[PDB]
Each structure stands twice: as structure tokens, then as C-alpha cells.
Ligand binder design. Structure first.
Ligand code: CA
Ligand code: CA
Ligand code: CA
Ligand code: CA
Ligand code: CU
Ligand code: CU
Lengths: 721, 718
């Protein structure tokens, strides 16, 4: 017996194209590009013939395939994109079995508590030196696989370490005063609590809302105000902002302004309700899913690689041209790019040991009750890896992408597979280089970039991160922001209304009675670059205009002020895009005797106004707790336990436990293992073009080899000598 | 019959054979054809075509009738190009008009024997009439006219001819103006050096055994108030030399500290400047792959099997909600005109004309062969004329359409530049996306239409992309690649004695080779007409203000808004942290906000960014070219103000460009404004850019700001 081809292929996730003239089907799915003609005894997979016992059957215009067709074709072996890893990479994320094992161990602990949740369950970082030895020398890591198990018992944090190899608990340590991030059940809890609140229902009624069942809540961390917000620093709290569900699939467009409820998660009740002036809920329908729009006609455009990809995916190891790297997933920061090497004519040179999003923050600048405390620490407080948004094939990534699935642990300790978690794709990126000498044959080569894309959605905003590997050694890091804007309900319909001026003091009026409150998007990337070795130094090269002292008509010259940045404190700074900042290896030089290096560019451009630092006065608490938001470049000594710019437990934190803390002892950065942290952000002043849904806005960062190589890296293999 | 592979490939089409499907896939620009041997029909952009003669497979080689190409490729099924029945008034001069204009000036008794033409271009009707043709189909009732700029020896003469009536309207000698460098000047310079006994003498001293292997490069000399010892009235060129060692890259073998000054009218060297003797770097450093083998790569294609979403009628391009006219100019290249955005059925003005204004690449070395080095690419050399034909599939993606463009050469003869401009649509990530927890995802892909043009001047190749976003945004990117201008030095490594001094003005990128520091400064002239002619310049500076609303916050995020009323105040530095809008104070969007376009002169780049001119305010280049030190400029619309560096920048003694255009500090309140964006890079070289430099890019953007009332890409309502 057989099954309908289209339906089955679609279910499976493959693109199906029928060519009536050629009587040919073209099926695409990740690295598999297949061609099959009805009735043929063979199909083509990535240019190779594949025998089929049962041919594709065409009936009354309906195609049918056998029940084994998907597996026979798509798992044939002719698609070489993915290869089986023989020797497990030490950095492979915990498998589902390991996750379950780690949970069983802690639950077997005499101290374990029954309502305990898991904020994070991740592989405990094997020693960096052994990992590199494995990647470069293939030496086995003899230290046991261990996992960090961070638990939330009520409101108390407990860090546990388990030895998976020996199936035993190594440590169990309660972390005093730390608050746990927001967990999935916290969201349902807040909605329920609000739903059972008599007072809230009453507060809501006297604001126009009739059916309180139509109120949609969103949970926000409260931050820290040394008590000015009147909140017990000891309790596990969350503030709640509400919207009215009008049935347009966009509750974000119907704010119930000036109503904030504070919920105590352990007490499971509203401990405080802050009420302000009553502002009529913006009611007009403002769907963003196209239900009310005409579907435009567009001609097909496809990016195809008929013979397969140029990259190979062995286990989680990616090999592409001269690059080699390990790609894993973390529930808090998302994707982790490790042991990145560049194959320089046979010799694999180290570039980056570990790279990933450090952390990010989206702080608002409106002082009103529903906004003064708004500051989202997306990864830290909400867990971006966990909130990964599966890639919409052909839309969120090009049609020639390969989408990977990633596994992490949910808050209850149960393995969770995120489908299409990360997209991998090669893309044409203009001419790599070109030279059309007058009267001579032209010289041009195409540039190819390997992109690693991951999307995470937290409430109303969607963030896209691209790790771009250029064939020439450069590495790009871009962040895109899109989603639905956080708006403030206001009385003005237009800028001509009486309250307009006051309503727009902290944001643009982007719709009737709707203001897009100004805020910033501040991303921070933690890049443990190991420029051709562990021991590096930070060097500054500031292009300057110097008085000409060589004679001739010129009064000035362009020279450079080169100097080393010897410590963390001095390395923590603002980035002038007019200057050059290098992470060099003072122990290795290129053919011209120049130290092998990488130029760090925390600011390579963006489509929204650039954030020059935090848009907060120096006396603000958010400013105090989070110092990473005010400097674009930071450089610290390597420490396996320092991975977040905002600190490990940022929820309700009273002091900088992040980059402020990591650079506090102002250690030496001379010829030692350095870790670069790039902070880049935008200052978002809204406009109507961004409502009801915002067009993706991007920011770019770059890491370029500087004298790391001896010549143009993409010239090709030397034909002589 | 005729062999297919051979005939088609001669035609410029790509031929793909699929043995499993016994199908040929033929591609050329907007035509995507499928044909099976022996079939009575073929498919052209998804549509059936009856064939007179089926393709025939002989000895494993296909054969097609001698009428195949015409029948299939010109069948009418490929709708990419459409006939233009009523020519746009900005259409560039055709080959016939160029020959005609030349005959008109040649018929005058004032025309001298060996006069050359620096520029022959259309003298366009007034702006008001061009916009009415574009928006109301109103005929421009003006005769085709042309500006004919002649170079008589070293004398510039500007003439105007009436093409319809075939008559000369004016002949004006331009006092003190020096003409741009013309093609023949390259040859005279080399020839003049070749016949110089003295030059040969100086060359022999420097190690060059065969003076016939010496390659000259003509450079304009600038202006140094006589301090360079050069006569202000002579037509001069400075010559920098290299040694040809047979590696196809003379640029890698500089003959340092040797400069000759040639007087083009006397046809002789009038000065030889000599500095210390530095042995010519001899090592072969080819950049053409003769000594390399590239790694094999799996094929990748970008296909549009049913044709393009854009239509090209004459030079009028229509794509999604955009409409614009693309023409070519011999001096600045591509001109984007009468740009409108179709807002739900109504065409709204966005930009009257946009194009490269001018650009400069000034060096920072004081030495003999570098102190005067400053290339005014379009101005002194003619970038349109020097356009580099796009290498299909490489300089532009495989799904691009390559357009041919016509300009007049220096002798007044029409020259068709093949594949002069690339037009292509491209996937650019998600236009927007929102994955609401627990709900069906919402995502749409972003499509951008790019207009790409490449011009090469001497050793450097510049790529320009005019990018139209479906959502109303317009991007303008500038890429730089080519061969670096290097200085010969004695140091081989940084461990050598002269290393420190050899690298004072640039990086040691190869043994004995220093990539001299310099800047790349591009300037774009954008006659934006935001939803109309009358606009105003508005500043919006995000600031931190004390909270006065109560609550725990000590500060707030607010905006300082204010109009910039005059040209002098509009000439400014650009803080990427601020917002600069060109608003139309007479029209507002649904929320009462003035429809506007946000101007961003600096949206990013891959090389260090130029904050201004890396020159002391007393340098002559600094004085001559004010445009290099300010990122934003706004002036009153004037049809004769088109170049930031001035109309005749060769040896200019003062700013006749933007410095002159903003001179009178006129009012920019509710009037026709012209935006000029200066964007540049400061280049400090590295070994990874030698012998050939990987393309470096700079980005700029023009975004609609309350021009619309909502997300522009959602679509029309049902
Ligand atoms: Ca430290
Ligand atoms: Ca390091
Ligand atoms: Ca204008
Ligand atoms: Ca003026
Ligand atoms: Cu935003
Ligand atoms: Cu350069």
C-alpha cells in the first residue's frame, strides 16, 4: 500500500515542486535536493542515482509514493551533509538521557524538595586546555562528564553538580539572596492569580473592561529600587502589565494603561496593585497576521544547491572550507560556537575557544507606573535558548538553509527538542574581490559566507542572531530585532489633540491612542578569542593627524598612535569606530614580523540610531546594577565561571555581579588568556512604519584577521614550490 | 541547424543539461527557458511556446534552428523588458544624439582641429516638467538638448546644442578651468616618459635595467599655492612609476621617490623630482590566479523560473511599489530619477534625482611621490566612462539582469558599455516576524531590489549599490576592492632597521611594501522630494532628562526636536546616535506627524570610519574640498550644483563645490532641498589585503519616518 505524495512530503517538511512540462518532481529538504519522474525506477539525490523498487505513482493527477519513500530517499546516504561522529566531542550538550540522569541524581538527594524546578541544567565546562587538546590533537578528555543543575526550591536557588560518568552527586550549594529567573509556570500562575483576584477584576471594571476573562497578562521582573518601589527585597515577585483581548490576535495593541499588579509567586497572590489615571483602552483591531490583507502575488525565487552543501555536519561539528567549529545549545544564552579554528594551509590555527551571546537588556525610558521599572534581561531573566523560536523554512532563513534541531531541559527537568532551532546556510555575498585592470581580462571571485542563525522570542519581541563566517577569516555577528512594539495607551488620537505633547514626551504616537515608548536594545557578546594561541594582549591603534616634519608642501600627515592596554579597567571603554582595537598574540608574527591579530569592531553599523551607552542618568539603579550597558568594549581575564555581562542571578540584583564585578580587581591583560565582550545597541524612537508589526532592524559587529595571515586569504592554493 | 551550446553561449546564455530529465535549462537575464530534445514546445518563464523546429540531438550534441534564439528569447514570453512608446525626458543621449551633437559643434567656425570632449550629456528639461511627465503623463514640450563640454588643447569650452532643431545655442569658453584627465593623456604620458633621455637616466640609477618595462600612471597635481613649484596655467600631470616584472601586477613594483611632471601641451617632462633610491620590490605578486588553484565548490544558483518581479520599459524600472528611472552619465555613473512610492494606488514623490555626487581618495604621506596624491575619481577621471562590465554570476548574483548603457567617448564617438549595470532582487532575511508563544507564527521574507554599478580607476575598483527595500527604505552601499597603492621601502620585516620609519605613514604589508594610509570619501547627491518639493530639515536628538513625573526614576528618555533653518547649520557632523529628518511640513500621516524620510549618512562599514578629513584645516586639499569634513549637507535645489568637489576640480584654487553651494547660507525652510551625504573610511592596511584587497563596504540609509501610517508591507486591505 502507498500514501499520497504531497501531503506526506509536506508533513515531513520538504518543499515539493511539480514540473508539468518535464514530468518531473523536485523535492527539497535541508541538504537533500531530489529529482524524481513518475514511473521511473530511479531518482536523483544530490546528483547521484538512487534505485527505487516502487516508483512514484501518478494517478488521476495525484502522485503516490510507498510508505518507505521518505526514509529510502531522505535517509539514503547520497545526502552527505550530515555524518556520524565517531568520537564524542567534549563540548556536546547534555543528551536527553544525560538530562534525565542528572535529574534522577538530584531527586535521589536526601535534601531534594518535591516542588523543585530547574532554572538550568547544562554541561559543566570541561577544562579549556583539555578541550583544545581534543580538537587540535584529538587527545581524549579524561575528566568525567558533569552537569550543572541549578534549582529553584520555592524562591531559593541551589546549585548542584552531578558526575554523570559515575552517576553521583558531587555538590549541593544553596545560593543566598539570589533570585531565580522567570520560569514557564510563572506565566500561567500570574494569569490565574489575576483571574481569581476580586480587586483586580474591580480595578479592571472601572477602566472600561467588562469581561475580565478577556484580560491578558504579561509577567515582568521588578528590578531593584532600594525600596522606593515599596517592594520587599526578600520575596519572589513579578509585576503584571495587562492588555485586552479583542480577537485580532494582537492583545499588545490594546494596553490597559496605568494598572500594574505585583504578584508574590510563593504566596500565589496579588500583594499590591498600583493604579494611575484611567485611559480608555485602544480598541481598534490591529492584526499583524494578514487576516485582513490581500495576499500579494509574487513570482518564485529559489536558492538551490543541487549537488549538496559545501559544509559537513559531523555530530555538532561544522566543517566549511577552512573553518571548523562546534555548535551547541544552552537554555539561557542560546547557541554556543566553540573551538573555532582556521585551517591555514594544513595547520589548524586557533581563533576562538568559545563565543555566544553574553546577555542583553532592553530598558525603557518612561517614568510612569507601568514603565519605570521595565527593563528586560531577555536571556538572564527569561531564558532565550528555552524560548527559541523554530525557524519558518524559506522565510526566517533562505530556502537553501539546513535547519538543525536542538535539545535542552525544560523547567521540570524533562528533555525538550526544539525543532528547527538553528539555521545553517551558505550565501553569495558579492565579489570577494575584484580588479579590472584597463585593457586586461577582468579578475573577480565570488564571496561566500556561512551563516549560523538563531531566533528567540520573549513576549512581544523577536531577536535574530547571525554568526557569519567569511571564507577570508573574518567573523561577523549581527542581531536583528522585530516583533510587536510595547505601546502605551494615551488619550491623543493625533498630534493635534490636547494631550499629544505630554503623551509623546517619552515616545512617538504611532497609532491613535498608541505610543511606542522609547527604549534601547543593548546586546553583549562574550567572545573568548584565542588569537592563534591562549596568550594575547590588547593593542590600540588610533589613526591621528600629525604635523608634517618631513618637508614639502604638506602641513599634516596621517599616522597612528599604537599602545597596549595593560589592564581590565583601561580595556573597559567606549568604542570610537574611527580607531582600531586588536587582540594580538605577542608570541607569534606573520611573514612581515607583525603580531598575528584580530581587529575587534563592536560597532560596524546598524539600521536604527546607535546607542552611545545607557540612556540613564548615573544615579539610576538599573545603571548601577548593569554596567555593561555603558561601554562597547570590555576585556577580562579568562574564568570559566564569568559568562554573563549582567551577572549570573540578575533578577532583583542589588549590585553589578557581571562585567563590573569581573573587571573590579583590574587584573593584567598582558600576554594572557583574554576574553572580549562587545556591547552594541540601538536607541529606538518609534514611527508609524513599525506598527502593528516592526520590520526587522539590524546591528552589525565584526572580527577581522589583522596580519594574522601573510596575504589575501582567498587567493587559493599556491601552484608552485 | 546550428550547434546549441556554441550558439547559446555566444549569445551570453547559460546552458544546463539534466540527463535524468532529458531537459535543457537555458538562462539569460530575465529569460528562464526549458526545452526537451524532440519536443514540439518549450517553456519560457513558465509559459508554453510552440516551436517551429524541435531541438535535435545529433551526435550527443544538441542542434537548434538558426532562428531559435530569436524565436525563444525574443518570443515576448520574457516580460522583463517592455517597449517604451513615450520616452522619459531624462533618457540619456542616444548614440544618434551624441553623433548629432558632435556634428553641431563641429559645424561652428569656433571648433578647433583636435578638440576633445570631456563630457557630452543630456541637458534636461526643468524639474517641474519632468515630474509632471512621470506623475501625470504630461508631455515635456521642450526639445532634446545637450551640454557639450570640449577640451581644446587645455582650454575648456562649454556649448549647448538643440538636438531637435539641430542648432548651437551657446558657446562659452571657461576661463581658468582645467579639464579632467582623458584617455589619450594616459598614452601621451607614457610616450613622453619613454622618449625622455633624462627619465631613462634617473630610472637606470634606481636599478631598472630595461626602461621599456617601466609603467607610468598619470595623477592630477592638485594645488599648493605655488609651493609645489607648479605653474597654475599649464595643463600638468604628475607621473608615478612602476616596474613591469611579468606578473600582471605592476602595482606591486613601485619605483619609489621618482616623480616626473609632464606638461601635456608641450608634450614634455618639465620637472623631475628625485628622492632617496629604494630598490624596486621584485617578487612576483600576481592577483589573477595564474599561480593558484581554487578549491572546488558545489554549485549554487538563484533562480526565478517564472521571470522577474520587475519590469524595465526603456530605462523606467517598476518593482513592487517602486517606480524610478535609471540612466547613465560619463562622469558620475548611474542616476536614479523620478523615484516614487506607490502608496495603496497613489504615487508619492520620494526622490527627484540621486546619484554619486563625487568622491575622493586622499593620502597621508608627505614624501615626494605621495604628498599631492588625492584621487577625485569621478571628477578628474570619469567613473561612468571607466565603468567595469559586470562579470556575470560573480560581481552580481546569478539571478541578475545586466543592462548595457551608452555614453560618448572623449572623441565624441558613442560607446556601448556591456553589462554596465546589474539589476537584481535578493532575499534579505525576514521582513518581519512575531512568534507569539503558543500561536501560529507570523513571518514574511524581505526582498530588496539592487542596482549595482562598478567603476575602476587605475588600481581601485568601486562598487555602488542603490538598494530599494519593499518597505520604503532606500539603502546606498559603496564597496572598495582592487590593488592597494603601495610605497617601496627597505624594510622586509618589522625587525629591520628602517621598519619604524618605513611604517610611519602606513602598514608594512609585504616585504619592502607599505600600504600607505589614506581615506575613501564618497559623497551622494540626493535631491529628495519628500512627498512633494517643499520640505524642511528637522533634528531629533535623543537625550536623557531628569524625571519630573514622580516615581523612583531619576531620569527619562526624551527627544530634543528642532528645525535646521539654513544651509550653514545643515552642513554638519553626523552623530549616528541622533535622528535627522527631511520632512514635508505641508503633509502629515494619519497621526498628524509630518511625512518624512530619515537620513543616515553612516549606517556602518567594514573598515575604520572617517569622522572627517584626516587633514589639518590648513592643508590645501582640505580647503579645496569642504565636503570631506561634514557628513550631512542640505542646500537649496539648483540644477547647476551637482558635484561636491565642484564642476572643475583639477587644480582648483578654492572650493567651487559644496563649500560654494552653501556659501550664501540660504534658507532651508519649506523649500526644495537637496541632501548630500558624505561617508568615508580611514584605511590602515594589513597583509590580508595584498596582493588584492577583499571588498570592504560602507552603508548609508534613507528610511521613511511617519511617511506611512503603518507597516508598509502588510499589504492592501481586503
Ligand atoms: Ca578579572
Ligand atoms: Ca582567550
Ligand atoms: Ca528636493
Ligand atoms: Ca545655496
Ligand atoms: Cu525597539
Ligand atoms: Cu583603501
Amino acid at each position: 500500500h502507498m500514501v499520497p505524495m504531497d501531503k506526506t512530503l509536506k508533513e515531513f517538511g520538504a518543499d515539493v515542486q511539480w514540473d508539468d512540462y518535464a514530468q518531473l518532481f523536485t523535492l527539497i529538504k535541508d541538504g537533500a535536493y531530489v529529482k524524481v519522474k513518475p514511473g521511473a525506477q530511479t531518482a536523483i539525490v544530490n546528483g547521484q542515482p538512487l534505485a527505487l523498487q516502487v516508483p512514484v505513482v501518478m494517478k488521476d493527477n495525484k502522485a503516490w509514493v510507498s510508505d518507505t519513500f521518505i526514509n529510502d530517499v531522505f535517509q539514503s546516504g547520497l545526502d552527505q551533509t550530515f555524518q556520524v561522529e565517531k568520537r564524542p566531542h567534549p563540548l556536546n550538550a547534555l543528551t536527553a538521557d544525560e538530562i534525565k540522569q542528572a535529574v534522577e541524581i538530584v531527586k535521589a538527594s536526601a535534601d531534594f524538595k518535591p516542588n523543585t524546578r530547574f532554572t538550568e541544567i547544562s554541561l559543566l565546562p570541561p577544562d579549556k586546555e583539555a578541550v583544545w587538546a581534543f580538537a587540535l590533537e584529538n587527545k581524549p578528555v579524561d575528566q568525567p562528564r558533569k552537569a550543572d543543575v541549578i534549582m529553584l526550591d520555592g524562591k531559593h536557588i541551589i546549585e548542584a553538580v552531578v558526575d554523570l560518568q559515575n552517576n553521583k552527586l558531587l555538590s549541593w550549594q544553596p545560593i543566598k539572596d539570589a533570585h531565580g529567573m522567570v520560569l514557564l509556570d510563572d506565566f500561567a500562575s500570574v494569569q490565574n492569580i489575576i483571574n481569581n483576584s476580586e480587586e483586580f477584576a474591580a480595578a479592571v471594571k472601572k477602566r472600561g473592561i467588562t469581561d475580565a476573562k478577556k484580560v491578558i497578562t504579561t509577567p515582568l521582573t521588578v528590578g531593584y529600587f532600594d525600596g522606593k518601589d515599596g517592594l520587599k527585597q526578600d520575596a519572589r515577585l513579578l509585576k503584571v502589565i495587562s492588555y485586552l483581548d479583542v480577537g485580532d490576535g494582537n492583545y499588545w495593541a490594546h494596553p490597559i494603561e496605568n494598572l500594574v499588579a505585583v504578584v508574590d509567586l510563593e504566596q500565589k497572590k496579588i500583594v499590591k496593585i498600583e493604579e494611575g489615571p484611567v485611559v480608555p483602552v485602544p480598541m481598534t483591531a490591529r492584526p499583524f497576521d494578514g487576516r485582513d490583507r490581500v495576499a500579494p502575488a509574487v513570482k518564485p525565487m529559489q536558492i538551490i544547491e543541487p549537488e549538496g552543501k559545501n559544509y559537513t555536519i559531523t555530530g555538532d561539528m561544522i566543517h566549511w572550507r577552512n573553518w571548523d567549529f562546534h555548535l551547541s545549545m544552552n537554555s539561557r544564552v542560546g547557541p554556543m560556537i566553540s573551538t573555532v579554528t582556521y585551517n591555514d594551509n594544513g595547520t589548524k590555527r586557533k581563533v576562538m575557544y568559545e563565543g555566544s551571546l553574553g546577555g542583553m537588556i532592553v530598558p525603557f525610558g518612561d517614568p510612569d507606573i507601568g514603565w519605570y521599572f521595565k527593563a528586560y534581561l531577555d536571556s538572564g531573566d527569561y531564558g532565550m535558548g528555552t524560548l527559541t523560536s523554530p525557524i519558518a523554512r524559506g522565510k526566517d532563513a533562505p530556502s537553501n538553509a539546513v535547519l538543525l534541531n536542538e535539545t535542552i531541559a525544560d523547567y521540570t527537568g524533562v528533555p525538550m527538542e526544539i525543532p528547527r532551532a538553528i539555521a545553517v546556510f551558505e550565501r553569495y555575498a558579492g565579489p570577494e574581490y575584484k580588479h579590472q585592470e584597463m585593457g586586461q581580462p577582468n579578475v573577480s571571485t565570488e564571496r561566500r559566507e556561512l551563516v549560523v542563525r538563531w531566533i528567540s522570542t520573549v513576549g512581544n519581541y523577536d531577536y535574530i542572531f547571525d554568526w557569519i563566517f567569511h571564507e577570508n577569516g573574518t567573523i561577523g555577528i549581527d542581531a536583528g530585532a522585530t516583533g510587536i512594539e510595547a505601546v502605551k495607551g494615551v488619550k491623543a488620537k493625533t498630534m493635534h489633540d490636547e494631550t499629544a505633547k505630554d503623551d509623546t514626551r517619552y515616545g512617538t504616537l504611532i497609532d491613535h491612542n498608541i505610543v511606542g515608548t522609547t527604549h534601547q536594545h543593548i546586546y553583549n557578546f562574550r567572545l573568548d578569542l584565542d588569537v592563534d594561541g591562549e596568550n594575547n594582549s590588547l593593542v590600540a591603534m588610533d589613526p591621528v593627524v600629525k604635523p608634517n616634519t618631513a618637508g614639502g608642501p604638506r602641513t599634516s600627515t596621517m599616522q597612528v598612535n599604537q599602545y597596549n592596554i595593560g589592564n581590565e579597567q583601561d580595556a573597559a571603554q567606549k568604542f570610537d569606530p574611527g580607531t582600531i582595537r586588536l587582540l594580538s598574540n605577542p608570541n607569534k608574527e606573520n611573514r612581515m614580523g607583525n603580531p598575528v591579530s584580530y581587529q575587534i569592531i563592536p560597532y560596524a553599523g546598524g539600521t536604527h540610531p546607535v546607542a552611545k551607552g545607557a540612556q540613564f542618568a548615573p544615579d539610576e539603579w538599573i545603571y548601577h546594577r548593569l554596567s555593561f550597558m555603558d561601554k562597547q568594549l570590555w576585556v577580562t581575564r579568562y574564568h570559566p565561571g564569568e559568562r554573563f555581562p549582567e551577572g549570573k542571578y540578575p533578577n532583583r540584583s542589588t549590585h553589578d555581579t557581571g562585567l563590573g564585578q569581573y573587571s573590579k580587581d583590574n587584573e593584567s591583560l598582558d600576554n594572557t588568556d583574554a576574553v572580549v565582550w562587545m556591547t552594541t545597541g540601538t536607541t529606538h524612537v518609534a514611527r508609524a512604519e513599525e506598527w502593528p508589526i516592526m520590520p526587522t532592524e539590524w546591528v552589525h559587529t565584526l572580527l577581522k584577521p589583522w596580519n594574522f595571515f601573510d596575504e589575501t586569504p582567498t587567493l587559493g592554493a599556491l601552484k608552485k614550490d
